[PDB]
Amino acid sequence: QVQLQQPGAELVKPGASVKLSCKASGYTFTSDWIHWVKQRPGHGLEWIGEIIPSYGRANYNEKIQKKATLTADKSSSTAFMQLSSLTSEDSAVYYCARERGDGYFAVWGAGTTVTVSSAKTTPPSVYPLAPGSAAQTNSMVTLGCLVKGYFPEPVTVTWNSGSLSSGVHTFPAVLQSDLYTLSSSVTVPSSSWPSETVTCNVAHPASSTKVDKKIVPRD
Amino acid sequence: QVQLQQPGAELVKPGASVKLSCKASGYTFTSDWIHWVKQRPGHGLEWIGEIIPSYGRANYNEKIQKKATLTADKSSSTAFMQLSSLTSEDSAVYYCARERGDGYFAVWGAGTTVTVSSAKTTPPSVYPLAPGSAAQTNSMVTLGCLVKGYFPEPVTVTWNSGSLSSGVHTFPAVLQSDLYTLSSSVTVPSSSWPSETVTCNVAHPASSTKVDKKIVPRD
Amino acid sequence: SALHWRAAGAATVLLVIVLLAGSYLAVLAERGAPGAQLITYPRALWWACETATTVGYXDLYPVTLWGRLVAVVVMVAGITSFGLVTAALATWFVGREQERR
Amino acid sequence: DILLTQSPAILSVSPGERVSFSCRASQSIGTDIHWYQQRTNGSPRLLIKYASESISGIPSRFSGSGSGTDFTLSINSVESEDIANYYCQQSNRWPFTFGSGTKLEIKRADAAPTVSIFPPSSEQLTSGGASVVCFLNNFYPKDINVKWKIDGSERQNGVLNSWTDQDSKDSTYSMSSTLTLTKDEYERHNSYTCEATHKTSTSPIVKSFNRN
Ligand SMILES: CCCCCCCCC(=O)OC[C@H](CO)OC(=O)CCC
Ligand SMILES: [K+]
Ligand SMILES: [K+]
Ligand SMILES: [K+]
Ligand SMILES: [K+]
Ligand SMILES: [K+]
Ligand SMILES: [K+]
């Protein structure tokens, strides 16, 4: 089972502060340290700090400006990172990781996408994408679903609740007027659709909204 | 209170010798070292030597020629540096500093400006600088005082015994015919002068002469 | 309080004194020698402790004649003191063992 | 002996921006590096000790980092009062040594100079001398030229100039030009002019006075 659980996203206004969480499960020892790593889009991994829950002490990366304060909760087995007075420079994915005190990160959280914007949260509109009536087909057919009008990132798109992974392409989002848009693509053998269902599941953590959209032929 | 007190200046003739002093106050410990640092105009800090008063031992920078001999006086809490057989190369500001035996210089003296010249001491002439009768004024007015005919450096210029720091510019001295000249500038709201006094205080340590000069409008 | 116990406590107080005087004199001896590292007091007291217990990691050590002479006094004072305690624990055990007989 | 190299020697940054000074030691010195600030005409001031430890009385804006041979002094959102020279110093091995220094320079908005002309004082004349002082204050960039005209005719003899370093109050520069002439030479002339040529104006800013 997932050893470190973190929220998928957090929207924060410039100057404001947010507190990220990392809930841990599995074996826990007195010698465990929880680390936080920051990664900006298209960039590398940057170490932020660490904390040893069993004792409550934290250390921080001195090469960078201190935006973080780490704390832990022994009873709930949760580590927290308080980021404060944020700006666009602070927008990135923040991962927590666990180290058994022997130097390497055995396991990582999925990461919390943080966005620092004055903008406002907005769920995505999910529309189907079935071939046009004149579109000829081969041994395979391609369907997809369009996701637009959302903010902030990210959204997770799965096909048939995950059972359909092969033949899937979800394109990167594009930003236009404080709203993101992306499309996901799926290819199944033409003889299997629409006899066998094909639904796209779209989750948008920042608004706590998950919606499905079955893909059927036009008219 | 000022922890290390040093004379403002010393004039020395080539070949002669001078003994600089550094009087210390505040907490004093057996583990204190007093350091001497030389700085030539426009250049960096150069370590000269150190002495541990409680024991009387001194060490010196081996990379440079030895012009210094350090001694200390336990009773008067004063450290002394005897510079001997000086030349123009030895003209610079000499600072003393205190280190609690842990490697860094917690506090520094104001420094003694040393000048090696065959020239002669000469107090500065302080003249006023009030706008001309035709000079139009804005919401602010600028006054100043001219200091010329002095030697050696330096001179310290304050406005209203220090209470007037903001809006002040004291230009670097210029050397001409064995005499220095400089001017200081002050800007106060035009409505405040001359209703409220504005006097420039000029101190010249090398001649033990401090003089004031109130600034009033012409005729 | 028996002699062995007194000599022990006395050895311990003397050790603490040798450690503080050793730290002071090592810095005094070493400043002035180019390349020396045993030159500020907090690390010299630590150097003094690891010398007295004979651990000698190292991370620091004297390079001058007087700093080394100071090092030898610290070594000998620590070895003597820890040895005095060992010998005091022996006198204690021997005495109590003659009572259990 | 340990050589401390500070590069670049001059660092230019924009107000509020983040800056970093570098200090490299010729050999490894753990964290035995200390940073000092020295403003124009001031004495050095301790800013950070042992590479990253705070000093009481120093704005939180200042921070240090590094261990080994490479050290950094950082300033979050630089401001005018930070204009100065910065030095590192090591205490790992005898003898202590200093780095050569980095100068912090701030790039602010262009500012026209405030020119002021001052006739010689009566106290000075009485001693048989005359000095006409002109101040070109709070301008930016520092590049500037000053011309003297006596009765409409440019004068060059007896003119001494002086420039200040970037001001730690507003990040500007100022200059003073002084025309020194005998009471005689000063008596056989009418008007004196000070002309300032600066990047902020195609036309020169001038100030003049006539001894009536
Ligand atoms: C049993 C003997 C243990 C000796 C431990 C010495 C540690 C020296 C040190 O790192 O100390 C570091 C600090 C500064 O960070 O120095 C101080 O002001 C502390 C005074 C000792
Ligand atoms: K041993
Ligand atoms: K050993
Ligand atoms: K050893
Ligand atoms: K060893
Ligand atoms: K070793
Ligand atoms: K033994």
Give yes or no: residues A110 and A164 share one domain. Answer: no
Q: What is the C-alpha separation between B80 and B23, in angstroms, rounded?
A: 9
Interchain contact A63–D (C-beta under 8 A) = yes
Can you tell me the distance from the alpha carbon of D88 to that of B107, in angstroms, rounded to the nearest whole number?
A: 15
Residue with tokens 């035009």: B190
Phi-psi region of A91 (alpha: psi -120 to 50; beta: other; left: phi over 0): beta
For residues B10 and B87, membership in a common domain is answered with: yes
Pairing of strands B9-12, B112-116: parallel
How far is C92 from C85, CA to CA, in rounded Å?
Answer: 10
Which residue minimizes the CA distance to atom 20 of ligand 1? Answer: C42
Q: Which residues line ligand 1 (CB under 6 A)?
A: C 42-43, 45-46, 49
**Residues of the domain holding C49:** 1-57
> Final residue of a domain: which of B118, B142, B168?
B118
Q: State the Cα–Cα distance between residues C80 and C74, nearest whole angstrom.
A: 10
B94/B10 same-domain check: yes
- Pair (A32, A110) in one structural domain: yes
Atom of ligand 1 nearest to the CA of C19: 2
Could you tell me if D119 and D204 lie in one domain?
Answer: yes
CATH number (domain holding residue B9): 2.60.40.10
B100 and B58 belong to one structural domain: yes
Whether chain D has a CB inside 8 Å of the CB on B66: the answer is: no
CA angle B74, B79, B80 (to 5 degrees): 130
Q: Kindly list the residues from chain A whose CB atom is less than 8 angstroms away from the CB atom of residue D65.
A: 62-63
B168 lies in the same domain as B213: yes
In a shared domain, residues D196 and D174: yes
Angle among Cα C36, C39, C43 to the nearest 5 degrees reads: 115
Tally of CB atoms within 10 A around A88: 9
Identify the contact set of chain C against chain D, taking CB-CB distances under 8 A. 30-37, 39-40
User: Residue C80 and residue C88: Cα distance in Å, rounded?
Assistant: 12
Atom number, ligand 1, closest to the C-alpha of residue C49: 2
Residues 6+ apart with CB under 8 A from A71: A51, A56, A58, A79, A80, A82
The answer on D119 and D196 residing in a single domain is yes
- Are A7 and A23 in contact, with CB atoms under 8 Å apart? no
Pick from D104, D115, D109, D102: which is nearest to D71 by CA? D102
Q: Which of residues 98-127 of B touch C (CB under 8 A)?
A: 101-103
| B208 contact partners, CB below 8 Å, separation of at least 6 | none
CA B22, CA B81: separation in Å to the nearest integer?
8
Q: Residues A184, A123: one domain?
A: yes
Task: Note whether C24 contacts B30, CB cutoff 8 Å.
Answer: yes
B17: DSSP letter: -
Which residues in chain A have Cβ-Cβ distances shorter than 8 Å to D76? Answer: 65
In angstroms, the Cα distances linking D134 to B132, B151, C92 are 12, 23, 93
Range of the domain at D195: 109-211
B142 shares a domain with B101:
no
**Cα(D193)–Cα(D117) distance, rounded to whole angstroms?**
8
Note whether B105 contacts D: Cβ–Cβ < 8 A: yes
Q: Are C62 and C38 in contact (CB under 8 A)?
A: yes
3-state class of C21 per DSSP? helix
3-state secondary structure (DSSP) of residue B51: strand
Q: Do A62 and D63 touch (CB under 8 A)?
A: yes
A193-214: burial string, b at 16+ Cβ within 10 Å, e else: beeeebbbbbbbbbbeeeeebe
Report d(CA B200, CA B160) in Å as an integer. Answer: 6
CA C72 to centroid of ligand 3, rounded, Å: 14
CB D139 within 8 A of CB D200: yes
CA distance C47 to C31: 15
Q: Do chains A and C touch (3 or more CB pairs under 8 A)?
A: no
Ligand 1 atom with the shortest distance to the CA of C43 = 8
**How far is the CA of C33 from the CAs of B100, C36, C66, D84, in angstroms?**
19, 6, 11, 34
User: Domain limits at B49?
Assistant: 1-118
Same domain, A113 and A125: no
Q: Ligand 5 mean position to C60 CA, how many Å?
A: 9
Q: Residue C32's closest chain D neighbor by CA?
A: D94
Copy the structure tokens of residue B115: 């000048």
d(Cα D181, Cα D131) in Å, to the nearest integer? 6
Q: Which two tokens stand for residue A192?
A: 């299997």
Judgement on whether residues B68 and B42 belong to the same structural domain of the protein: yes
- Experimental technique behind these coordinates: X-ray
Residues A72, A135, single domain; the answer is no
Question: How distant is the Cα of B92 from the closest Cα of chain C, in angstroms?
Answer: 25
Candidates D18, D65, D76; nearest CB to A62? D65
Last residue of a domain, one of D108, D132, D159: D108
Within its chain, how far is the Cα of B63 from the centroid? 27
CATH number at residue D140: 2.60.40.10
Query: Total structural domains in chain D?
Result: 2
Q: Are strands A92-99 and A33-39 parallel, antiparallel or unpaired?
A: antiparallel
Cβ pair B192, B157 in contact under 8 A = no
Residues of D in contact with A62 (CB under 8 A): 52, 63-65
Query: Of A99, A118, A137, which one is at a domain's C-terminal end?
Result: A118
> What is the number of other CB atoms lying within 10 angstroms of the CB of residue B157?
23
User: Which run of H or E residues covers position A155?
Assistant: none
Same-domain pairing of B209 and B181: yes
How far is the C-alpha of A213 from the C-alpha of A130, rounded, in Å?
12
* Strands annotated E in chain A: 4-5, 9-12, 18-24, 33-39, 45-52, 57-60, 68-73, 78-83, 92-99, 107-108, 112-116, 125-129, 140-150, 156-159, 168-170, 174-175, 180-189, 199-204, 209-214
Which three-class secondary structure state does DSSP give residue D122? helix
Of A118, A144, A175, at which residue does a domain stop?
A118
From D108, D138, D171, give the residue that closes a domain: D108
Q: Domain check: are D166 and D201 in the same one?
A: yes
**What is the domain count for chain A?**
2
* Spatial contact of B109 and B97, defined as CB atoms under 8 Å apart: yes
β partners of residue A107: A98
For residue A32, give every residue at least 6 positions away whose Cβ sits within 8 Å of its Cβ, in sequence order, or none. A52, A53, A54, A98, A99, A100, A101
Q: Which of residues 16-55 of C touch B (CB under 8 A)?
A: 24, 27-28, 31-32, 34, 39-42
Rounded to 5 degrees, what are φ and ψ at D22? -110, 145
Between chains, do B46 and D98 touch, taking CB under 8 Å as contact?
A: yes
Among residues A83, A152, A67, the alpha carbon closest in space to that of A113 is found at A152
Of all protein residues, whose CA lies closest to atom 16 belonging to ligand 1? C42
Query: Closest Cα to residue B34, out of B22, B26, B45, B20?
Result: B22
Strands D10-13 and D102-106: parallel
